[PDB]
Design a protein around this ligand. Sequence first.
Ligand SMILES: Nc1ncnc2c1ncn2[C@@H]1O[C@H](CSCC[C@H](N)C(=O)O)[C@@H](O)[C@H]1O
Ligand SMILES: [Pt+2]
Lengths: 265, 265
Amino acid sequence: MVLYFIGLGLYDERDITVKGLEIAKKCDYVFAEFYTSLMAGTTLGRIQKLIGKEIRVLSREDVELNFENIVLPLAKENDVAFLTPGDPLVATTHAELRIRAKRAGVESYVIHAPSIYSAVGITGLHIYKFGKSATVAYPEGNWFPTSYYDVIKENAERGLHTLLFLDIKAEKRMYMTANEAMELLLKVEDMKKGGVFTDDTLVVVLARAGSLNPTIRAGYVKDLIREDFGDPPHILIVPGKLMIVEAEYLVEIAGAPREILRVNV
Amino acid sequence: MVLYFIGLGLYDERDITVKGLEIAKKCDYVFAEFYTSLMAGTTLGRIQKLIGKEIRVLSREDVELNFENIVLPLAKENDVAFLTPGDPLVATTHAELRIRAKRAGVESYVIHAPSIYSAVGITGLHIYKFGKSATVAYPEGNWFPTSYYDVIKENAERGLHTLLFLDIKAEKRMYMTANEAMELLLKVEDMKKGGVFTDDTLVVVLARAGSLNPTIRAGYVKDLIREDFGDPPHILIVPGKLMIVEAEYLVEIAGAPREILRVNV
Ligand SMILES: Nc1ncnc2c1ncn2[C@@H]1O[C@H](CSCC[C@H](N)C(=O)O)[C@@H](O)[C@H]1O
Ligand SMILES: [Pt+2]
């Protein structure tokens, strides 16, 4: 009669919370999805070893369309767990699954876990200064998305930082890199000429948040566009006007140019 | 040799990640501060038991003035852990402590944990639609803080949601309730008369996130200002323009008035 939405955390199998692991252990059935994001710091096997249960993976369609024919039925007579990377209900569509539960007579509880939304705090930028978020999507065919460009403009216009998730083809295991993201934005700046993203724009790159050795780099596009940030996942951030304390962090912890202390404050 | 910043989580001692626990367990000295947030589902005793180490708790002064005198010295000879509620670098000024660590020749590592900043997802509001954040501070003496009010206005103008952290006076054991935040906002509305916060405004209240049964309620200020949401911590949210699915979630899961279902696009 109970369904648990349990977050798996940021990077590896140790990133799940104690509460999430003990509840998952007492569940009769354990499902998981890996299309909204991947756990690049681990594998399905390791997660199964840690949980001690057989984990049935669900595709985007299993979740979006048939969640009620796959997960809810069993949750009607047993205790089920639905594992997701990061924090549950950050994925725009997951919240609705709680409504599907209710109409099926199934109760549901949420067990939180670290999300990249809070972890960006490791970049030293204040959390209250992050504005609207966006996702940089790969262009394809005759389609060239650019709304993420306008999000940056509106945020920075108000002195706000912009958090940009990079594109991901989970099934294919293809991660967009900060580098490609920077290439797209430059390609967009060229077409919209709004003066939002150029070689002189200051940006921050966070890679493998959750790991003990994340890559935190800050600098101007012209310098980082071809820098190696390591393995995925990559998160890109275009900060607004910096607070002096913010800039000092980037310089001392993220290897930012001393220049940002007078140019971006 | 090293300093670890380990987040404790939202509600109780189980909200710590597994990675966080296994690391804390192997540390020589464990410190912690419980003034930046409130973990209402546990005690220091339960945390000490889980970690199997004694925990010396620090005050805001110990930390803000003597972190490098109390904690750092030990980090040069041992593995030291500094524990905090939620995520260590979210809505705190601890990020700067990593610079003090650097200037003392101490490598530091961050272990994240569930944060109220990402747990807002349980309210059904799309987390990418949250704009600038703010804190509703306690007026004291003749000083009456009001800046969080302009933050709401600016967000609402863009259709973005506003996350409001509520003030906390740990040493006086004071934890601002959503009710108190609403009272203060109304008073600020009288002064500025900008039409940003009134009896007819729709608000959302999340109390004790992280617990299995948090209180999630959405409705008009005139109806909620006097409602009892349970023990703190409280967070107050002022939604921007609602998308249909956000509205349905608020109606289905947060007991919101069924009229918010009809959206004005
Ligand atoms: N579990 C919880 N439920 C409701 N609100 C909470 C909460 N935890 C913290 N808060 C809100 O957040 C404020 C503290 S700000 C610091 C919180 C911590 N850095 C984190 O990442 O969550 C509290 O005063 C309250 O306004
Ligand atoms: Pt600041």
